[model samples]
Target: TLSSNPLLQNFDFPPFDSVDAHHVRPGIRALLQQLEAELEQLEKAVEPSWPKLVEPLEKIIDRLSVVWGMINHLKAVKDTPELRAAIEEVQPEKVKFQLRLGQSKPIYNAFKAIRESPDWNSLSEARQRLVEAQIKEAVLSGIALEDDKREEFNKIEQELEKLSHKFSENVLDATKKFEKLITDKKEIEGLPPSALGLFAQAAVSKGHETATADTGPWLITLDAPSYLPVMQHAKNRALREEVYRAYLSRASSGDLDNTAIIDQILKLRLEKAKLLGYRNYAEVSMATKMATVEKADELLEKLRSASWDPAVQDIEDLKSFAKNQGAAEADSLTHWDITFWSERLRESKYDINEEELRPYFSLPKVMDALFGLAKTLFGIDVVPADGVAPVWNSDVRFYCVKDSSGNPTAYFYFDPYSRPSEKRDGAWMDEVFSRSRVMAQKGSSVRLPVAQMVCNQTPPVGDKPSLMTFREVETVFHEFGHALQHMLTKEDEGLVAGIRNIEWDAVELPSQFMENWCYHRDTLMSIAKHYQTGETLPENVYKKLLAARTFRAGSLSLRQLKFATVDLELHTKYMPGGAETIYEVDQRVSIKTQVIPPLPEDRFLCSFSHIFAGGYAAGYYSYKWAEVLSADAFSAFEDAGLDDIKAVKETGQRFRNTILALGGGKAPLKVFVEFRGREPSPEPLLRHNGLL
Candidate 1:
């Protein structure tokens, strides 16, 4: 039955249009059976070398990766009960199979033998790195544990994976269950036309009687497109508070409460760490990551101290400015009032309205400029590849990347729109396929990389073609940075190719580094053309944009630190069922990181999917950590000249070859130093954030 399953069949890329929920179980079953048979043969090999042992395993592993990756990716973007049920049915078996492989003594000893063999020194650098990483990972995965302890660890792993899935689902369902219907036009006073169109679309979809332009209803949800405009632009204070409270309190109570789930997850993590002979989960997490707990803590503390006074002053300035403007809540502002008042203050001070800049950043124009920027920097070209590949949605675009000589380098799919009903929130880059020296089937043909870049910006209104905010423009750049790293890799081996085994904390460097280009005058002007007139952004508007770059940097910095601090403390300091609740730990950290303390109703941790459900359990601080690396890395380009096209191109190619080209083949720090000719400095990050 599985012989003809599209999910099991070898294909160039994911046949998204052909896969279904019914195919998932049969496909995974057959693949795992094949893997078991391969392992059976592998156990009999007399002498283990990279070719004799690892390459065969790599074949089955890559096959499993593509099949399972497609299943999980679909569950995320086009979720349905049938798909979810199918994944749930097969996920446990998959997890147990992985645990069994991790504990395989024969497999572990084979890798260990390969590492100690004389050929280890004779092997390529990438192969050596792969062997080293595999040995260490095997140990961490319970290779050294006794049978009883290993059994216990396997149970914990299964439960943790299940809990993480539950946490994510709770958040999604809770978000979808909320809706805000406002019949009064006065409530949405200051919203832009884009937001207004979305609200009208929501109203019509919800069957609100007489929902129209002048005399009608507006429907909003907890999704960003609807929620952000209300918080940032609504004139009614109550409206903003309603949405803010709902957003922060998601998955906190009722049927989808995540409080207990979070507690259980933390407890299991600590147990797992202890079982592995580590002091805390953070230590266990950092063992493979680039940053040590001490170093992560040191960096976090230094930034906190530097930004503390500035954050205080920034808040004070906002309050005073709001008071002068006669805002009702200015004297004693609540958390809900911050965005609304700060936006007004920004406009009054710099004459820079975010909506006014939208016309210059229509999605199509920004995309062309982004692709053009890639060409200028790395000598690559991106052209649409419509109908050449199958896509799950009509809006999903396929593009082909070509080298300077017009050779095909890679391909990618761009899914850009907010679909709260189906797709998850947030923007990210994921691999559909990775570059490899050998194909999974024949094990001799080179396969180019493929990537999926997903974002949730406001959708195109009638004929407006998806006008984007500057922040959205930066997001597109950030995700593309990740895509470039995947597609532009010089590495050939699948194990270390293009972000395959990179440390989690350092993975953000390329993505964040790309964001710096958004602030460059030349880069910005190239991308920013009026949607209708095709005129470049005026110099005055560009200047205003530049001036407002760090308008609330201090406050924003503290918000991130607050999340980082809470995350670290939860895994390192706090204990489950201890005298101090997680809320207490969170509040204690906020004493220094926040100017306005969280209200009792603020269940920030309840919805902090990054730390709990996401892979960033003890690693949320990576954002700031990698930002420091990125800022220093970008300084090389700044040194050459931000606007000099020739110099920029030269620097960009060097960066590509080092930063993007290296993938995960070498140490992240070593890669950075090779690119920059020195260690990274916090000075660049501080300067970029206007802290110095």
Candidate 2:
């Protein structure tokens, strides 16, 4: 039955291009009603036996999961005015439904009854584990709370969910609202030509008075893709400052301010943490994660110390370079200037610039190369989606991934371009709908897998096709590696599939390990060629790419570690000390890397969507934790020779059977052992960081 569906439907945006605002309410109302009926059956099970609890509930969840996935996909990628309003109205109600499901009187009583029963010992081991997991989840949701406490907790959670959504929306709104338009050509004296074209396109899109490169100055925005290049590559001081100030002021001193939201969120989170019998938000959050709060702290501190000198050295080198260029030693590099200066410095030191590799990294070629690598390793094929309906912009394409036996296993979709309604961010893979066994059993193969990979890269400029720098190419490959895990997951339980079941700290293994492919000369030669000339990437250029790979590893690794550590610490140990300021706290812990000269207005934490709003919470340090796993895992290939097909096949199958198939059903460390032949060591990661 699973074979009937497309394997790669990752980019399944909801029906936005077709449905008008009026259609949403009726459609979602019906959807919600169906879910309610399903929930009633799940909750009102006649008996709380193992069979009654596991199979039936999983079946019901399969449908609910797909529906919820579709709804969220619509909301996140193809968001419309109507969809936004509908989500705001329905999301809290959905949370209530979840709470009721988790903590309903009947379910809690059933779980408690099982726990108290002498016959519980007679249950099969699988059934016992099922009950244990269910009971744990319910208790975590406060299902065991006394009636008054339960009711109050649900109310708070519902309100908190809504506020978090609003907080995120406010930040995005503020970011989208502001822009810097330069009509005066003299104002853009030092701006890169590429940066100018990007801004010129933005101006035309905004319906501002028409201006060409010949007649008008460039416009810029706070979007990372648009703004970062300018700050790093631009030549003018005053213009850079202008853009820097606007970037700093995002979601601050705005009509859509997030300051009050940030304050209240921290307070409520701390209160909730205390309610959950934890000293701080971090403790409650990371209880289930592998890292202890102190371990996370230690890791962050270590990375901070390691990053500090390098970051300081980096800045000092740049300052010296700037001084030689006739700027004051104390001229103070603005936060906006860091990327620009770093790029300049990297060019001077390594004789490399990202633009040089763009000829080889057109989207299609990158995909082809990525597929070839997968084929060589995993024995999987990626083919276009023939019949699937796409909801949003037509730029999104769907694909089906099949195994060596030619059975469909994964569905993937790519939404690769910038648009007005699109999310303003770089690339990431979201587990929209995971592979579940219940669905597989019920001939629900149509819903085997769903994942969305989004990127805000440069769109096709004029007639020139959309192209990517090598960095962007690496990003694309890295995210798909995450998608492969998602799609290939053979987990029988809906609870653990691909990235879903892995520990936060360990989840980056698949994604980051995938990035290693980009650096392989053989892999690059497979797909990377000049778009027009069909000439393969030159060996000299490829070597330069590899040589430059470790050029700033210290600075980069430390910057990430700094964020990851600050994230864990803030949630675990730090409290919102009235007006002591979240930004100030961030600066204190984060400045361990000293990447920037410092700015009074540089507040990155306010819009830190990962820790503040997303699932990372106190577990953001996992990026570093998993980086270690990745480095060690990728070393296998390097040792065997990068193009060893037999090694690739063996490793790929091992990864799938051990990691993808098990999903979250078993402990991640167990999965890691099966794949790596040992417990993942941290030394590889440290060595990569030059800390060894």
Candidate 3:
């Protein structure tokens, strides 16, 4: 029965169109059985050489990775109950297989032999790093534990896995369950046609076929496309308040509450760290990260102190602006009022409006500029390759990245729209395939890489194409930067190629580095032609964009600092039964990191899926940590002169060679200095944020 399962079929890229939920269980079962067999055979036949040991080892690991990766990717983008149920059933068995692999004493010892072997000097630098990382990881995976402690540690792993899944599901369902249908016209007065179209489409999905953007009913959910416009543009105060409260309080009560789940997760993490002889979970987490606990704390403190006064000034500016405009909540701005007044002030000051600017940033328009920038900098072409591969959805696009000589370097799939009913929120870049020689196709010595870039921007409606908010435009650049790094690696060694094996805190560097291009005058001017008229963005409008870039920089920086500080404290300083609970820890952190404090009932942490469910448990500070690196890297291009073509191209090529090409082959700081010729400075980040 498993022989013909589509999920088990070997393909060059994912064959999503031919796969289904029914294929998941049998395919997973057969592969695990076969993998264990291979594991046993190889365990006894260990050798210190790469070909004799590591290559065969990778073949075993990549088999499960190629198959299980597809299954999990499908669940994220096109979720269904059948797929979820199948995944749930096989989840425990799969974890057991992983644990078995991690605890393979024979393989661990063989790798150690390779490290001590006279031939260790004969290996490439990347392969040496690969061996080192694997050995380090094996020990961290509980390989060093005694038998009794090992059993206890393994159970904790299983429980952590289960709790993480539950936390994610709680947030997803909690987000899905809330819907506010508005039939009144006055309440949506300031909403532009773009948001209205989405709300109308949402209404249609919920059984209101007669709904139209200009007419009767509009559905509002907790999804970003629906929720953001209301907070930023809606004229009705009560409507804004309703949405604000609902968003903050999601997954905080009822059966879906993640409060207890978060508590349990933290306790298990601490126990796991203790089992491995670490003082706290953050100490365990920092082993693979670039920053020590002290370093991460120093970073959070530096950013907090830098932004503190500027943030105070930001609130004062808003107050004066609101009062002069004669708004009712001028002196007493609440959580619901901040966004509305901020947008108002931003527009009043700059004469710029996001809705008005949306037409200039139609998705296709921005994509052309994005690809064009690649050509300008790295000499690569991103040309359409649709229909060359099978996609899971009709909207997904396939593209090939060609080098300067027109040879294909890599390929990618872009899924760029919101489907609130199934797809998750946020944007990310994931590997569909990593470049490798060992895993190469029959005729090719080097297998090319493939990337999956997914975003949840507003979908096209009626006669219009998908127009983007300014922030959404930046998001596309950010995710594409990640894809570019994965797709552009020069490393032939499979394990260290692209994003693989990079430090957790440094992994965000490439993604954030790409965002800096979005603000370049030439880049912005080239891309901002109005979709309807093809008119260039007025110089005044462009200046306004440049001017407004740092409007709320301080306050926004503080918000992120607050979240990062809270995450670190939760994992390090605050024990489960310590002097203060998680909520108090959060509140205490905010007094220094935030200008406006949280409400007593603010259950924001209950829905903090990043720390609780996602891999960023103790590493949420990575965003800011990597930003310092990214900002400093971008400043090299600035120092070269943005308008100086020769200098810019030279700097860009250096970046591609070092930053994007090196992947995890070298230490990240080594990579940074190779590109920037200096250690990263916090001044660039502060300068970019308008606080310097």
Candidate 4:
């Protein structure tokens, strides 16, 4: 009576309307069986050809990719008890099958033979790279290990897969479990109207009877939109400390604590890396990424040196400013006071507050301006496709992207608002389906690329639209930058199409490159308009925005370097059972990079999802690593002149062709060289961050 299992239904686009958790297990089981049968047949083949072996293999994997990818996406966005149960029910089986395939000796031999064949050199560069990468992956996957070691390796893989999911679940559940209810209106003073409205809505949503404008009570949750405003603007110091402690203590000490999970995950990761013949997990992690451990450490330490003095000065200046504001405890300011005083200092210096700029940068205006910038730069057009396909939430929107000639080239789904209870916290771009010449039906054209661009920004309150802070606007641009790379890629092979197979360390280049445009006057003016009055941002305010861009940038850079350094150290240097706890290692690194040392109870590693639950691991430094490439890449445009529209467009197209269109067909450095005509320099990154 409900819609049929959507996962079983083959379509050009995913049928989000008909899909449900009940279908995931059955759908995946059927696909895996089909894949197994195909692989069995291929294994028995007398001779392997690219067309016979590789293309068929890719087709079967592509089928699994679509179904499994959709299920995982729903788990991230619309996670319910039933969906979580469904995923857990079959995830073990799925991982086992994947592990078996990875360690398949016959498959490895076949690939090796194909590579040795005379036809290997005849294949396209992307195809050749695909085979080479597959071989390397198979080897790293423990295909070459002895049977005992292989079994151990597979067990570790399965355990790690489960542990990562648990880590994420713990974080989410812990995040949603804590809330503060206030009955006093005096406690809500100094809060903006929108934030206050959000608090009222939160109370009412929880079934409070008297939650209104003149309400007796307001509710606050640990979600970013709710939590950040209180920290930055709440006049009550006790209130700020209350929320800060709750946030930092999440998944740290209670039943939901990720401390044990982090320990087990690190231990398993180390064992797995050793089994793969790597010295540590960092080596395993960086084998496929752009930067080596030594290289990454060099960059991190170099930046730490560059930022330390200025970072110290920045903290001193903030303390001095806060002291001058008549705050008795300013000299001993804790983490709770940084954002608060930073906001206060920013107002005194630049006469700007983020809330004051929010109205002029409503989500719709910002999106329109961003799309227009894409048009001006790359000549692509973005059009609304609201009813083109079904969506999981009404907040999600569909879009059709066309090339300069108006050919529908790609599609993307945008999920832009926060759902703290359901959706994960972060902004990201992922492939829903990739472009593949092999996906062509007997009588049909090539399958077009599709992407999912997701963000967790402030959601709309009762009658008000979602107004974006400058940081949120930049976040939108950043995710769209990733979407552009996925959608605009000219590569037709699924192996290298769009962002697929790109180095983890290099993937952030496009996303960060787009963030630079957010600072440009032309880009900002086009997108930034008042929601109610249609007024553009004033020139004076824009000047203030630009002036405040690098304010406290030294401390900011050091803060990131702290995270990156700790992550790299944990994976590369820490021994699992040594006397040193992960926290101690984190403190040692933080002391070097942090202006203020971390609190003893601050279990930051527990919620470090980027390294633990996500794909970052030792690769957390990629954000800074790729920033070097992004900053240098953007400098090309600056050298030509941001003021010159013609030059910007010309440079944008060149960037699109080399950076976006190329995907992962070539080595990252070579692709970078193709675009920039040389190796990247840290000078631009230093200059952009105001370190030089």
List lDDT for all candidates, in order: 0.85, 0.70, 0.87, 0.85
Q: What is the TM-score (0 to 1) of candidate 2?
A: 0.74
Cα deviation of 346, candidate 1, in Å: 4.6
**lDDT (Cα, tens digit) per residue for candidate 4, span 107-153:** 78878887888888788888887888888888888887889999999
After superposition, the stretches of candidate 2 with alpha carbons farther than 4 Å from their true spots are: 1-28, 68-100, 108-137, 151-188, 191-268, 329-339, 346-368, 381-434, 441-472, 530-534, 575-591, 595-616, 639-644, 686-692
Candidate 3 per-residue lDDT over residues 1-692, each given as its tens digit: 67788777778788877779999888898889999999998987888878778888888877787788888889889889999999999989998999898778988989999999888889888999899998989888888688999999999999999999999999989888889989999888898899999998899999999999999599988888888999999888998999988898888789889888888999999999999999999999998888889988988888888888999899999999999999888899888888988999987886677788888888888888889888878778898999988999999999999998999999999999888877888888888888887889799988899999998878887878888878888988999888989999988888888888889778889889999988888888888888888898888878888778888989999999988988999998887866678777767887888788877777888888899888888888988999999999999998999999988889989988998898898888889999999877888899987898
How many Å off is the CA of 469 in candidate 2?
4.8
Rank candidates by TM-score, best first. Answer: 3, 1, 4, 2
lDDT of 2 by residue, 388-419 (tens): 74546778777888878988788777888866
Angstrom error at residue 681, model 4: 2.6
Cα lDDT of candidate 4 equals 0.85
* Residue range 529-576, candidate 1, lDDT tens digits: 888888999899888777787788888888899998888889888889
- Total colliding residue pairs, candidate 3: 0
Largest lDDT belongs to which candidate? 3
Cα RMSD to the true fold for all candidates:
5.8, 6.7, 5.8, 6.0
Ranked by TM-score, the better of candidates 1 and 3 is: 3
